[PDB]
């Protein structure tokens, strides 16, 4: 022992690197990998293109007396995206599906400061050196919007001071009243509940459009334009011809 | 005149059954095949579906496909400030030969 270990530990990490580096085969490709087998390649989908862009802004200001006094203005957002990729030839063919998604800023706003929201205590560096085990990360360390019961619950079990490597926040000051700044309403970010369901690759089923007058309205207006040239082995048989009344009437051929 | 581009026409492949073509049989096909209505637009009455509009072509409905129209999910009542729609919604099917506007 300690040789089977220090090998199983190292060999385990190799297995972990295959499920994530080769998705849509988890818990099945590693099993075949250990025995020295492979999977059927042609069943899996694959990505063709991926484009992203940040919408520009143009400001149009009112000139009437009311607009000048109050300072009325409008924001217009637009963007253009296009790609050109080759189609992958297959014996049985396939379907190419395109998507167009508009999302707000993905930046946290409700998260206590790791240092200033906790007691100022002197760290024992020697003791922290002898710490190579997964420490708990309980709720109330990620956001202040936590119920009484959820505070003790463990969200994820990882890290030694991992909540201090990087801190990112974007939100309004707590002193400010959101009722104001309705003409400077530059706020559109995902207020995810957090804490509960830490693992989630899905947006909420109902994301309101705060900056827009109607939250249930479809804000965007997309215009698509696709052109495809597809060499195919289809016969594309001939083009018939119309009938001339003179023939079969005046007997030109007799 | 407005834009002369079709908007009501089923997709030749995605609007029909996915079947495997017999290339050998299609080689021995040099006769005018029927092109019945319901292959040109979805705005067809019950009786007109069986009627033959024109009698020509072997897979001629797949050489070129052109469409310009609003998404069926969208409600035309909206986009009254982006109303970029002006095209000829000809009845089609009936009177295929016509060099005259409505």
């Amino acid at each position: 022992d300690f040789y089977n270990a220090q090998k199983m530990d190292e060999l385990t990490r190799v297995m972990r690197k295959i499920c994530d580096d080769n998705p849509e085969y988890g818990e099945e490709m590693v099993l075949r990998w250990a025995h020295g087998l492979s999977v059927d390649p042609g069943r899996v989908p694959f990505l063709l293109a991926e484009k992203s862009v940040v919408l520009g802004r143009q400001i149009i200001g009112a000139t009437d007396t009311a607009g000048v006094e109050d300072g009325v203005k409008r924001s217009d957002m637009a963007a253009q995206l296009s790609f050109t990729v080759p189609i992958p030839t297959t014996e049985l063919g396939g379907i190419i599906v395109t998507f167009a998604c508009i999302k707000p800023d993905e930046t946290l706003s409700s998260q206590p400061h790791p240092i200033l929201a906790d007691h100022w205590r002197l760290d024992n560096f020697v003791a922290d050196e002898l710490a190579l085990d997964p420490q708990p990360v309980m709720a109330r360390e990620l956001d202040y919007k936590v119920a009484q019961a959820n505070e003790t619950t463990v969200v994820f079990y990882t890290g030694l001071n991992e909540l201090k490597k990087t801190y990112v926040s974007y939100g309004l000051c707590r002193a400010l009243d959101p009722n104001t700044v309705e003409s400077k309403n530059a706020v559109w970010q995902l207020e995810v509940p957090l804490s509960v369901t830490p693992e989630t690759v899905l947006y909420p089923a109902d994301l309101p459009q705060y900056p827009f007058a109607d939250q249930q309205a479809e804000v965007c207006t997309y215009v698509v334009q696709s052109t495809a040239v597809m060499p195919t082995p289809m016969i594309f048989g001939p083009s018939p011809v119309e009938q001339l009344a003179v023939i079969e009437t005046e007997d030109l051929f007799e | 005149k407005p834009d002369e581009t079709l908007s009501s026409q089923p997709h030749p492949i995605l609007a029909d059954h996915w079947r495997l073509d017999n290339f050998v049989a299609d080689e021995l096909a040099l006769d005018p095949q029927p092109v019945m209505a319901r292959e040109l637009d979805y705005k067809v009455a019950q009786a007109n579906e069986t009627t033959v509009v024109f009698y020509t072509g072997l897979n001629e409905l797949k050489k070129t496909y052109v469409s310009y129209g609003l998404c069926r999910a969208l409600d035309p009542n909206t986009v009254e400030s982006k109303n970029a729609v002006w095209q000829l919604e000809v009845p089609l099917s009936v009177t295929p030969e016509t060099v005259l506007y409505p």
């Binding site: - | 005018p32 009698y55 295929p96 005259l100």
Partner: peptide, 29 residues
């Protein structure tokens, strides 16, 4: 020669010509 008003325009490409069709094909060809 009884027309006394404007006329509708003429299509750039008819349906039959668009698909390269024909109303009544010939048997000889």
């Amino acid at each position: 020669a009884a027309n006394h008003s404007t006329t509708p325009a003429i299509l750039s490409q008819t349906v039959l010509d668009r698909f390269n069709g024909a109303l009544d094909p010939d048997p000889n060809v």
